[PDB]
Amino acid sequence: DTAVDGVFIRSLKVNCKVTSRFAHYVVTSQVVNTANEAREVAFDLEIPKTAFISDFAVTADGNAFIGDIKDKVTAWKQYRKAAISGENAGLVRASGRTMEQFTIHLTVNPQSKVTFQLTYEEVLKRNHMQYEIVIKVKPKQLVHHFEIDVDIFEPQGISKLDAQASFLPKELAAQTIKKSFSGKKGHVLFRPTVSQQQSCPTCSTSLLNGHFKVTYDVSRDKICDLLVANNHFAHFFAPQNLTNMNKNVVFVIAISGSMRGQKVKQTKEALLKILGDMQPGDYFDLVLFGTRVQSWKGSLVQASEANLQAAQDFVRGFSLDEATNLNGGLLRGIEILNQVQESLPELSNHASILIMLTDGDPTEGVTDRSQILKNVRNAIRGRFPLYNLGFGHNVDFNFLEVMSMENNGRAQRIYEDHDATQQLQGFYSQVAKPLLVDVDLQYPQDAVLALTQNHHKQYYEGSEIVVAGRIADNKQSSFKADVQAHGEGQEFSITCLVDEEEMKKLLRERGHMLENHVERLWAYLTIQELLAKRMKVDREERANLSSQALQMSLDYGFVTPLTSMSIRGMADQDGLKPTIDKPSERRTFVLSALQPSP
């Protein structure tokens, strides 16, 4: 007896198609109302913030409804005069660090069969030597036909594949999770029977509460991974077996009074572990900034046994100092790294890295954020990346993102939680092992109509550089790529030519879906890139980039910060349509076939 109040979940299926890192999710739920009265049913699931919703369909006993994508402004016009805000009314809202919650409550007719189907897509990003697919399993009821099916197709070949279900006991997971891979194809199938979903042999609650994680990576023996299909290309670059570069790293740490407690404790703990794993060939220094700026050595020193132990002692010992002189702290760390230009030229071939951690905004010294941005980029001058870590939600993170974007880096949020130390270690490991610097992927100008970022300051072990673009007509056959870069005292250079015979073979093995996903891979990366650029440019160019992002979101039907998806045919208590948006940083619906005629 799975049903609750006469409503049972007949089926809940997650189908993920991955093609050359492009992940295409389709989640389909069919709920049946056996009661002779009307019942409220829910379609509730979590999706990753990195994905774009591309389609949503609801079919109730032949009565079909579909989400129409439109300019966000147009979709939210119904909210202006209304008593609820579009943020509160939307079906999608943020629910965690990396996930968003999609929720709709619908009153269905008696003896009704309703099918929900949500589609969302993303380009998987490699980190820590793998791609990771996370699917939140939470039906809140027993499901007669529950299934997760992940179908992976990687031209370069799959090197490893794993599937983990934390909510399942080790014994239950083994018999129930089927996985296998050979050559280019990988498959994971999870099809628990109703009995296997039960917490106890004869109880109704379901153990299916948790996350279903699928991880994999592709064979990297072949350094060229150039995929061309129907005037669009994707180029994946991650050479293996390269020698770790020696690096010069300066940590700029906020020691404001606000850090008192867990934050300073977790920060120190992370620095101790980072210092403990530093390699003998590296050089480093530490900068603390409160109201006053203070550097451990004032210059890059080698990661000797003595220096590392002295630094750990310095880390354990420092105390907080009231305010936050962020401008002074950054300029001090930059000044130290720039000594390599004049005083310490023997370190010039190392990969330089600047990491800054702060839990608040500048309050001492120069506090004009726009001036700080100017001061920082004029001091670094594109010589090394800057990685800003925002600790907590009492800081202007947009300010940190723009600064990193203007200086060949990225910003990362550290959530105030019991695991902040592990979060900090997690991030640092992404940048800990630089292998190449000044990576320049070059393509024939006569063949490229558009392409994503093709210059990358540093390439790190475990990560990957990806470039996508659109090819001009009749230039696909001869398309090629040249990649230049530098190691530590070395020059890197390769050439990748499209393998026409292989491309045709891939098209046969994966079908026209290969062509579609390569193009949609390009569109996804282009849209994300447009959203990143627009936040770090003047307001005039911002409007230009916004219109580009709006047009691409509409062309490919993505729910992005510039678009919304509305469902005609449904209305809440106030006659408002269901609306689906991409969040930044209750109500129940009924079937309604009428709307006021304009």
3-state SS track over 36-51: CCCEEEEEEEEEECCC
The alpha carbon of residue 432 and the mean position of all alpha carbons in its chain are separated, in whole angstroms, by 19
The alpha carbon of residue 549 and the mean position of all alpha carbons in its chain are separated, in whole angstroms, by 18
**How far is the first Cα of the chain from the last one, in angstroms, to the nearest whole number?**
49
Contact 294, 251 (CB under 8 A): no
70 pairs with which residues across the strands? 564
556 pairs with which residues across the strands? none
Show me where the chain is broken: residue before each gap, C-N > 2.5 A.
Answer: 585
> Residue 339: CB partners within 8 Å, gap ≥ 6?
299, 300
496 pairs with which residues across the strands? 481
What CA–CA distance (Å, rounded) separates 363 from 441? 41
Side-chain-facing half-sphere of 143: CA atoms under 13 Å: 21
Pairing of strands 386-391, 351-358: parallel
Please name which of 328, 158, 305 lies closest in space to residue 253, comparing C-alpha atoms: 328
What SS3 class is residue 527? helix
Side-chain-facing half-sphere of 581: CA atoms under 13 Å: 22
Resolution (A): 2.2
> Nearest 10 degrees: CA dihedral of 370, 375, 376, 380?
150
Show the tokens assigned to 534.
Answer: 């627009």
For residue 245, give the DSSP letter. P
Q: Annotate 487-522 with three-state secondary structure.
A: ECCEEEEEEEECCHHHHHHHHHHHCCHHHHHHHHHH
Q: Annotate 283-317 with three-state secondary structure.
A: EEEEEEECCCEEECCCCCEECCHHHHHHHHHHHHH
Residue 348 is inside which H or E element, if any? none
Give the chain's radius of gyration (CA, Å): 26
In the numeric block, the tokens 């010992």 are attached to 317
For residue 259, give the DSSP letter. G
Q: How far is CA 522 from CA 119, 452, 530, 542, in A?
A: 18, 8, 12, 21
Strands (E), 72-111: 92-94, 99-108
Residue type, 594: L
Q: Specify burial of residue 312 (Cβ count, 10 A radius: 0-12, 13-18, 19+).
A: middle
Q: Specify burial of residue 400 (Cβ count, 10 A radius: 0-12, 13-18, 19+).
A: buried
- The C-alpha angle with vertex 22 and arms to 21 and 27, in degrees rounded to 5, equals 125
539 pairs with which residues across the strands? none
Q: How far is CA 209 from CA 44, 205, 328, 433, 476, in A?
A: 13, 10, 48, 37, 47
Which strands sit side by side in the sheet containing 63-71, from one edge to the other?
177-182, 185-190, 143-153, 7-19, 22-33, 112-123, 52-60, 63-71, 563-567, 579-580
